[PDB]
Amino acid sequence: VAQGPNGRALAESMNPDLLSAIQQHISIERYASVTYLAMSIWCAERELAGFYQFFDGEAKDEQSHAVHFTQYLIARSQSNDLQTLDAPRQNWDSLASLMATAFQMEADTTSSIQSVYALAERNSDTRTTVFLDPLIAAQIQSEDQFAYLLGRVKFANGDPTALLVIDNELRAGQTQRG
Amino acid sequence: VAQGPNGRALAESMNPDLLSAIQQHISIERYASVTYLAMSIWCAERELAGFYQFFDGEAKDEQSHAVHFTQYLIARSQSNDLQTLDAPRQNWDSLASLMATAFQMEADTTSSIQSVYALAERNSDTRTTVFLDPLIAAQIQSEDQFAYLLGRVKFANGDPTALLVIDNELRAGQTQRG
Amino acid sequence: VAQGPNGRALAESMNPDLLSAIQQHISIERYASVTYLAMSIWCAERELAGFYQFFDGEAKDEQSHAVHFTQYLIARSQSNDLQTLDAPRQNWDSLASLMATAFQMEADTTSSIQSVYALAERNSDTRTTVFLDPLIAAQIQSEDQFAYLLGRVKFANGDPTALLVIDNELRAGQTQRG
Amino acid sequence: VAQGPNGRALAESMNPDLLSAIQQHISIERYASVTYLAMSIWCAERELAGFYQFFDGEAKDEQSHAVHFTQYLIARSQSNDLQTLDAPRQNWDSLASLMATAFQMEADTTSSIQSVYALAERNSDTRTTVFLDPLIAAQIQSEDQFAYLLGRVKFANGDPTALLVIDNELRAGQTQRG
Ligand SMILES: [Cl-]
Ligand SMILES: [Cl-]
Ligand SMILES: [Cl-]
Ligand SMILES: [Cl-]
Ligand SMILES: [Cl-]
Ligand SMILES: [Cl-]
Ligand SMILES: [Cl-]
Ligand SMILES: [Cl-]
Ligand code: NA
Ligand code: NA
Ligand code: NA
Ligand code: NA
Ligand code: NA
Ligand code: NA
Ligand code: NA
Ligand code: NA
Ligand code: NA
């Protein structure tokens, strides 16, 4: 029995390019987390309490997704490498603009997973494509969700009354098409 | 065992300046109470039933805070001196203007406590700073709350529809960022 | 009514030095969080599942403490400024060495709060000293806790059997003197 | 409607190489089962009752996994071919050595599935890759589990006290990082 780079028994070696890609993806999700935290603060600063609560939860959920990846590396007997985290964006001119960045962030998170997925396929790492499959499924749901929130906010067309209505929807947990 | 000015056994004498400051602070909170009553009436007069209910409760709560201070003086064996209460403001041009006065009233209430706090520190009255600590903590929450209500009302920008939505929020007990 | 730097109604201006100190303290706690995450990974890599679970929870709790500070700034109508997060330490020669760093991290977190506290006292910011008081109280408990965990691990003197026993204690939630 | 080789209606023909690979994989899992039975006996012979119980359950679970594959062949209207089963290994010099073989057995089971998976991809048999996906997911968990058990036993470094502690963990059902 061989030992992996993190010292645990090694079921199957991992290509160093694939390892690096996963470690960077973990950074992407950690960065998405602090971005959603930044977005929650922006919403709180404008009394959009429902949006604040929503993004506070998204930040915690994205961090969980990141930790889920660190557990996979542990499971594969690979080393983790927790990286420097950039500061998030913190200023937006409108809620519509914030939601556009949020949607883009979710889509970019999926692109990162897709990048890791294709590397794993090239390396015939079937453990990793299997591991990623449900995360892609969740990303589809999140993209559908954030398209819904962005589109609904854009439909409001900057009217405060409509944005207060949506804010209250979010506070109630009405965050998807359902 | 010595007797305090109110006739009870005296654990520790209180500086007369500090006593006067507390007695005046009690007046401040009694005045905040009748102000919130005035504000509840203004809201009722305009069918803003949620705001009416909110301010009716604030008036009762502020009175309780005032009585809490009278109990402290009793506990310190100091005399109370319930003072003349000025008439409150009773006219505003808009709900936004009313909420501005309400926010200012809460902040001014905190300033009064801060004034008492600094006097107690000068007099090394640790009973009094300890007694005031949780009241300052509550004031932070109230300031955060009234900033939320004021900001949300200002966001409405005088639109009746938005103000009816917020009114209904208040009736439901949705009065903070949460 | 004046507006604070984050745009909300301003109950009382905050000195920019104090603001900066709080913003940096938020970074300290965010850094403590990712450090505990790093520590949880190290423990998982060595099959110390109880220590892994403990530090996984500490990481989430420290993040919550950080967010609690961001809410205070919101409450004070001050701007947040979420900063770059350094990479954590990730390598230790022994569990005893890891626990030493963990203890030091908790103590350094308290020192940071103490630094903010003294600045607030200089500025007579009683809202902030009151806000910090329960956090200092929690830090005392955490320091007592981490002294217990470190001392118990040191008592084991590197014996694997003893460390497995303690590991199982941690998995069960036995993490303090009780 | 055509009939498959086992006589049932045939939804889609299967390449004979892929069929043979699955039939041999069934043998692999049947062999893993009897190996874990052998391992349970070795542990029972040395009064390691927790390890005995663990491996007794693993043997039954591995047999279930094997039968799950036979059901897939039935579902695909393909013939099963239950093969001669070799005798398992039955002697080890230490629990650490036994656990090394167990870990290797789990990893080799995954390699067999990976081999079948790649054959199915070459044959564009999407039913089979889909069928295998959750089994690969389970194998990741089992590899993580057996790395944990092996690493924990190795950490004990042959000390009977530590091995008794771990034995009791296994009897309680504490068999993973959790
Ligand atoms: Cl908008
Ligand atoms: Cl951006
Ligand atoms: Cl208005
Ligand atoms: Cl006025
Ligand atoms: Cl140690
Ligand atoms: Cl260090
Ligand atoms: Cl051994
Ligand atoms: Cl062998
Ligand atoms: Na902001
Ligand atoms: Na980054
Ligand atoms: Na009136
Ligand atoms: Na008065
Ligand atoms: Na490590
Ligand atoms: Na940092
Ligand atoms: Na204090
Ligand atoms: Na035997
Ligand atoms: Na065989």
Residue numbers in the entry:
A (entry chain A), B (entry chain A), C (entry chain A), D (entry chain A): 5 to 182
Give the original sentences from the paper that presented this experimental model.
Ferritins are proteins forming 24meric rhombic dodecahedral cages that play a key role in iron storage and detoxification in all cell types. Their function requires the transport of Fe2+ from the exterior of the protein to buried di-iron catalytic sites, known as ferroxidase centres, where Fe2+ is oxidized to form Fe3+-oxo precursors of the ferritin mineral core. SynFtn, isolated from the cyanobacterium Synechococcus CC9311, is an atypical prokaryotic ferritin that was recently shown to take up Fe2+ via its threefold channels. The wild-type protein contains three iron binding sites: high- and low-affinity binding sites at the FOC, sites 1 and 2, respectively, and site 3 located in the threefold channel and coordinated by the side chains of three symmetry equivalent Asp137 residues.
